[PDB]
Amino acid sequence: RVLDVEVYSSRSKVYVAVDGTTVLEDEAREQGRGIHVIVLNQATGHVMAKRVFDTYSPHEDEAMVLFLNMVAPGRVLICTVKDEGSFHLKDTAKALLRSLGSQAGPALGWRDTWAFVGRKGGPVFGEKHSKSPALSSWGDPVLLKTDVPLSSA
Numbered sequence: 175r176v177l178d179v180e181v182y183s184s185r186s187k188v189y190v191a192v193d194g195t196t197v198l199e200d201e202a203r204e205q206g207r208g209i210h211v212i213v214l215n216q217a218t219g220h221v222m223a224k225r226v227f228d229t230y231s232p233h234e235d236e237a238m239v240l241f242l243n244m245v246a247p248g249r250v251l252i253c254t255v256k257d258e259g260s261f262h263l264k265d266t267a268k269a270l271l272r273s274l275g276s277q278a279g280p281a282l283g284w285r286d287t288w289a290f291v292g293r294k295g296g297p298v299f300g301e302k303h304s305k306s307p308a309l310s311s312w313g314d315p316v317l318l319k320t321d322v323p324l325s326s327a
């Protein structure tokens with residue numbers, strides 16, 4: 175059928191809920207910065223992997239690329255930003271996000287918020303993005319609600 179997916183991105187908090195159950199939550203004050211990634215099985219919605227890449231810091235984007243490249247094309251892929259995910263989100267990682275169909279990922283900027291749900295090998299199911307209005311500010315919280323189709327048989 176479908177999965178009811180909720181993805182929240184903000185300065186101080188991320189969460190992901192699937193069918194009304196929270197599968198990822200991070201509101202720890204000075205922890206969990208960067209891009210949180212959840213991978214779901216495309217038939218059951220079970221969580222196959224959960225990661226966080228602190229892409230405000232060097233080398234985390236490289237780890238993110240190596241991880242995403244191992245994710246199977248049929249998987250549901252969910253990304254959400256806590257605090258800052260762009261400073262060291264460099265060209266190879268942005269090109270990979272573009273190849274998934276993400277519009278905001280390849281454009282991600284300083285303290286922007288971003289929530290994404292898509293099938294790894296395409297298409298994107300939902301995406302939201304808020305641009306930070308000033309270097310001293312963060313993007314607005316975004317809460318993406320998306321009905322994700324499930325595979326069967």
Ligand SMILES: O=[N+]([O-])c1ccc(O[C@@H]2O[C@H](CO)[C@@H](O)[C@H](O)[C@@H]2O)cc1
Binds near residue numbers: 207230257258285
């Ligand atoms: O002047 N600057 O280049 C500059 C000024 C203030 C900055 O604050 C930091 O920003 C990070 C990303 O949001 C936060 O993780 C961190 O806790 C702190 O708030 C960073 C850079």
